[PDB]
Design a protein around this ligand. Structure first.
Ligand SMILES: CCN(CC)C(=O)C[C@H](NC(=O)/C=C/c1ccccc1)C(=O)N[C@@H](Cc1ccc(F)cc1)C(=O)NCc1cccc2ccccc12
Ligand SMILES: CCN(CC)C(=O)C[C@H](NC(=O)/C=C/c1ccccc1)C(=O)N[C@@H](Cc1ccc(F)cc1)C(=O)NCc1cccc2ccccc12
Ligand SMILES: CCN(CC)C(=O)C[C@H](NC(=O)/C=C/c1ccccc1)C(=O)N[C@@H](Cc1ccc(F)cc1)C(=O)NCc1cccc2ccccc12
Ligand SMILES: CCN(CC)C(=O)C[C@H](NC(=O)/C=C/c1ccccc1)C(=O)N[C@@H](Cc1ccc(F)cc1)C(=O)NCc1cccc2ccccc12
Lengths: 222, 217, 215, 218, 217, 222, 223, 223
């Protein structure tokens, strides 16, 4: 698995690959690892599929539950803390192999500077979290390839669409070096999924735009 | 036994009669909730779930406990099964059960009257449902409107003459406020279950926008 | 006590006397449930198990608790043993027990009256069973029909004079609606049958166009 | 305190008085149970254990609870010890205990009157035992017959005048049906069963339908 | 409080007076229990422990519960310590504590009167002991005889005018049956048992049937 | 131990051996492993003796218990279910050596066809059960010898008498190849036990008839 | 064991073999592994026999329980979630050898396009599930043989009868290469079981049809 | 330890040796292992002494507890069941070394035939029991020597005293071949203990009769 997230002027973008494995065998090609969990928040998870999907589903319910109970949504710090508490709660099972780590990307409606309101948070298996001040982050078995790729590409990130390109290219590199991360499948028409979040909220990036970016990267490397 | 019950019934009924009134009615875009409420931050109309809304009349702490319990019930069910499995009829039923239990076994009956309303999911054609649950667990299915709180028969009859199906938002809004007088943004709480929202149908109409909608032609 | 139980009894009886009426009667194809119900979506008649049906009169929240409790009982017993082992007599017996406990120990007695009905399994020859359980857990086994709620005496007399066994579905519904009158279009009736000709699950509602087709 | 028990006693006494009557009497082949019962399928007479039977009058849900508890008690005791160690005296004793606590501690007293009966084991010569347990837990050992529910005095007197211990099933059944008539009637309105001491293991057997008709007339 | 206690007292007393009578008296061989008991199989007299016997008057289900609690107490104490450590006065004291608690805290007081009796160990010279425990936990130490249940005053006085210490079994039985008559009685209407000091360990023995009648003439 | 059961036209038959062992030592010669648990069902158990007899006793109690409570006996499927639940509840204890597996044989009074109403159900240590449609089944340390013998003899089963002999001969073969299954002891006069079940109920087969069958098989092999 | 499921235009098909083993020994030939659990859904389970049948039974009861309690059946997503929660609840026991994995096949009456209303959901030992968007799936010890056969044969699936034939042929291949999967027994007349589910509901395929498809496959491979 | 029990016409006899050991060391010479547990039954126990004596004492309490609570003694099947339950109840502790097995000898007053009313029942650490229908049984570290001896001497048992003599001889043979079983000590005057049970109940055999029989055996084996 690889999930990537990065900040751009005015928002944040998150993308994830589509491969699922059982050992060496490919058991899924269309898997969805990036969810809009809230009007301003997306979570991508790497790890055991069952635990990953339970994390996303229960997280989204918890946020809206709070919103409907109290008439106001959680502050971004509160969202971070509830995710951290959930992960920490899974530590016992994770030590027995049911391990899943999330990556959180959001837009803080209350941030002072709308251009810096992008937020990226990484988590470890004990619930420790880091707000990434350097603009990008990744999680999963290809995360280091994606992080080292974005290290070199991030200077090209000037808007949401260039951020989207860099995200897809970093996933391409991860897939190139990690057999557990799946690249673009041009035979079946399957590409990474992406969510983009700006002041207007979180929206799913259409497949066709990711397809064009993927094909441009491919042909550019031939 | 018999007198305990009639004394409880009259305490609750008098409590509801002293409270400010709430009307909910179906219009072309879903369901409209209009409540007499001078407060600024204490609300009597709330979202329960994606397409399900709540309005209440009576003692605040009591119907707010019922509101939170309903939200807990809905989120719990949607998590256990699926979101699309949570329905307005379900919540109306749980409220009926809960208010029956409260009415017979707690120290004091709840002086509340509730409305649970449901609109269609996006892209579906399903007539809205309105449910009225009273202080004793009595439950009623309604098709056009629900009136709760205060002196009901003036408002209910005012709506009985003035109501028409599939009215526009502005028309329904002024029909509702008219029946309520039988009032402005600093004195009303207004919200809608908008069947044309893709996911969460509940929307408040507040402040500049609400006065706009009140005045516009 | 004597007058504690006397007013618990009177509170229940007058509650049921104020409620709309329900009829269940056996006919040639099984059992027919016909209830006065203005509601679009709140049901007084329900499936309990494969060949077992339920109908109720009185306060909705209370007999809905009883309906769910019976479904919980039946499904648990079928899981524990076998589906076949769940019987109507069984549910009727549990309702007698439960309403008895409710009647003596609850803060307020349930203002409810229940009917549990059973038809044959598919392809088997067994006369239908109707059981009526009242607010104190009294249980009676009835051979032809059951009346619950409201002013029952007139309806019972109407059925005593118009009922014939092995009637057709339309004849039975006619008679049922008549007796209910003695106390009604599509918009005011809830109708369902336990259909002995159905292979596994007998319960089936008759709604809308299909319903008015039969009046 | 005294008044509460007085009212519990009168509630239960009137409940049982409103109920239909039941007779249990000993005959040559064991013990016979006959109850006025319109119901096809709801039972006032039941097996408790191999050689031990049950009959009850009053409110159905209540004496059915007691019946289920007696079945639970016997099956547990037979399992813990041996089947032989389960006696009618034991079950009657537990019913006295149980109805006593019910009579004092439950929200409403149970409107029931019970009979526990026992016959000899196969090949043993022991006369039947009949025990009556009433709504307050009072227990009595009766030698010939027990009457419960409704207006008991007419039925009891008919039984005093007409009773024979060594009667056949047919004669005992008609003596019983007669006495029951005396206090206010065939297949469709009666429930009949016996503890048959000639059966090798489980003594309880119902008499239903055609067989019962053959026993009522000729 | 005085309301409650007076009512409990007389409920219990009236209960015991309407019941059939029991006498226990000391005689040459130990302690003799004679009870008016029509039943073939239900018992008012019981073994408690090696040298300790039990008799009761009143409601059968209640004094049977107490009988079982006593058998339990004795068997537990003998197991924990030794059989020789279980005594008549211990059982009497626990019956006092138990009936006192029952009398004040149970829903209805027990309508029972109990007698706990003890004889010497085999080959030992000790006076028999008789303890009488009443419905409220009052406990009495009596030297010659104990009367319980029904109209006890005729029977007590007959014993007073007829009792002699160490009478023989036959004589003691006659005195007992006579005093019972004062308050027609043969084998079929009596339950008889003895605490027989001459038995090597378990002293309790019933006297039934041929043997009891042989004693009776 | 070996227990066999087979269907014959109009009923079912079950037979079991009499041996009890503690390691290599023969600790019992007259033991009984086949119990009539109901008017229409017999159960035979293999395994730890204490557990085996506890199974038969409590199962028979459970069936009768249900019957007296509800006024009607359990359907045969319900009987299977309660035996399975019992076996499953013992799994924890079975994994540390208190293992016992039953074989259930019955006559289903509710089956449409009276001639094929015999039923044979086998069980595993976790409560999994199989209704045997091939006419015979066995359990215990010699069960595979007995099954392989019945595989060849089953075509001779035409009535209760041929079925009983085939059953006893299958136990003879199992005893022949497994030292934990006892064969007929003609010195002491101890023979397998058998129960036969038809529309008239379950009855113990008398010892003399099994003795005849055994002596006939022995002689038939000399 | 092998269970296969595949989508065809207008419905879904699920089929399973009939073999039961204890190590290498065959302990059953007539075993059923595919159950109609709901009017529009079937589940087939692979694994420990006791747990597999427990899942099938309790799952069907849970679906009917909700339907009778609330007056309407669960959405297909709800059905998925409950099967998943049950599987996840068995995880502890599965780690000690009482493991069972289900495969869910259903027809969603609420889907927009009835021709694509078939649904196939696969599960892992922790409750993770995947809705299979490539038309077929398998579970059990022969699942990879059966899956790889369907990869080559799936394009021949145009209706229910062709779908059923591909299902039976994939099970044939699984039996060819997996000894824990049983092939058609033409001596005893025991063949795989199948359920077909379309808008009119779920029905058991008669043994007779499966026999005919089996004989056709066998003849196609002999000459 | 060795405990023997054998049936004779009209009754049963049970006898046990008197040795107590801690490993190879003799820690007791006068110990008692055969207890009269009720008017018609004796129990002899082998194993850890603490557990053995606790078994005998608590069992006897349970039999009389039942008798006094219900007015009548347990049937022999009931006595057997209660001992089996107690034994099973000790299974965990026995697994950690507090192991004790009883041998039960009784006279069933309800049996049809008074001459065959003797009963001998053996138990295993899990509570499994066997009613021994060949007339004799033994428990303890010398049980197999005593059993094999009784196999050869049992045809001599015709009344109570011949049975007592055979029993004492079986304990003698066990002591001969088992160092944890003590033989007759003629220096200290310590002999096995015996209980005999017939229609008149269970009685302790006086020490003198066992001494006489013991010396007869010794004298016979020396010449
Ligand atoms: C969707 C279900 N499915 C269809 C049958 C699978 O095959 C999923 C696969 N389950 C397994 O590999 C089983 C793990 C397990 C084993 C024994 C006991 C308990 C659990 C998986 O999680 N794979 C992981 C990697 C992995 C494997 C084993 C392990 F222990 C830990 C991690 C993965 O690809 N994970 C990537 C992933 C991320 C977010 C959402 C997803 C949703 C679906 C599928 C994959 C998703
Ligand atoms: C009946 C009691 N008895 C006399 C004292 C025995 O010797 C039985 C023997 N117990 C033992 O071997 C001891 C079991 C045990 C061991 C360690 C800790 C806890 C318990 C047994 O079960 N044998 C089994 C085989 C066996 C042995 C050891 C083991 F761990 C598992 C199985 C057998 O023959 N079983 C056959 C059998 C089947 C049905 C009913 C029966 C009833 C009685 C006797 C046998 C029966
Ligand atoms: C039907 C019961 N039966 C009658 C004697 C069997 O022999 C079945 C066999 N039991 C066993 O292998 C014993 C399991 C066990 C062992 C020790 C402790 C606890 C449990 C089995 O499950 N086999 C599995 C495979 C297996 C075996 C052992 C193991 F540890 C894990 C898996 C199988 O074939 N499973 C296939 C299967 C799938 C769906 C429905 C079925 C229904 C009936 C039979 C089989 C079915
Ligand atoms: C009477 C108390 N006593 C003090 C002088 C003893 O020495 C008895 C001796 N206790 C011990 O050997 C102590 C073992 C022990 C207990 C708990 C934790 C750790 C170790 C014994 O049981 N001996 C057994 C044999 C044995 C040895 C070790 C072992 F682990 C288990 C069993 C025996 O002889 N048993 C024979 C025997 C049978 C019936 C009644 C008796 C009564 C008294 C003495 C013996 C009796």
């Amino acid at each position: 698995t690889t999930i990537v997230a990065l900040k751009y002027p005015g928002g944040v973008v998150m993308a994830g690959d589509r491969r699922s494995t059982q050992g060496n065998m490919i058991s899924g090609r269309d898997v969805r690892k990036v969810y809009i969990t809230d009007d301003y928040t997306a979570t991508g998870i790497a790890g055991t599929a069952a635990v990953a999907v339970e994390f996303a589903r229960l997280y989204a319910v918890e946020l809206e539950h709070y919103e409907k109970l109290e008439g106001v949504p959680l502050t971004f710090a509160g969202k971070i803390n509830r995710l951290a508490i959930m992960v920490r709660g899974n530590l016992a099972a994770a030590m027995q192999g049911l391990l899943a780590l999330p990556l959180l990307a959001g837009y803080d409606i209350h941030a002072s500077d709308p251009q810096s309101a992008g937020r990226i948070v990484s988590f470890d298996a004990a619930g420790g979290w880091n707000i990434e001040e350097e603009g990008y982050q990744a999680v999963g078995s290809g995360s280091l390839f994606a992080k080292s790729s974005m290290k070199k590409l991030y200077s090209q990130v000037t808007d949401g669409d260039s951020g989207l390109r860099v995200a897809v290219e970093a996933l391409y590199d991860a897939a190139d070096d990690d057999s557990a991360t799946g690249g673009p499948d041009l035979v079946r028409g399957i590409f990474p999924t992406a969510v983009i979040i700006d002041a207007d909220g979180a929206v799913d990036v259409p497949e066709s735009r990711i397809a064009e970016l993927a094909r441009a990267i491919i042909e550019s490397r031939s | 036994m018999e007198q305990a019950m009639r004394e409880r019934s009259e305490l609750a009924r008098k409590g509801i009669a002293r409270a400010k009134s709430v009307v909910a009615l179906a219009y072309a875009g879903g369901v409209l909730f209009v409540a007499e409420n001078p407060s600024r931050s204490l609300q009597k109309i709330s979202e329960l779930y994606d397409r399900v809304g709540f309005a209440a009349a009576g003692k605040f702490n009591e119907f707010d406990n019922l509101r939170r319990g309903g939200i807990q019930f809905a989120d719990t069910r949607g998590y256990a099964y699926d979101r699309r499995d949570v329905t307005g009829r379900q919540l109306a039923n749980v409220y009926a059960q809960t208010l029956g239990t409260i009415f017979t076994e707690q120290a004091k009956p709840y002086e509340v009257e509730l409305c649970v309303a449901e609109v269609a999911h996006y892209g579906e054609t399903k007539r809205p449902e309105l449910y009225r649950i009273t202080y004793d667990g009595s439950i009623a299915d309604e098709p056009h409107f629900v009136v709760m709180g205060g002196t009901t028969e003036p408002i209910a009859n005012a709506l009985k003459e003035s109501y028409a199906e599939n009215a526009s938002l502005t028309d329904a809004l002024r029909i509702a406020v008219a029946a309520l007088r039988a009032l402005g943004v600093a004195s009303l709480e207004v919200a809608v279950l908008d069947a044309n929202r893709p996911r969460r149908a509940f929307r408040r109409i507040t402040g500049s926008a609400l006065q706009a909608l009140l005045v516009d032609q």
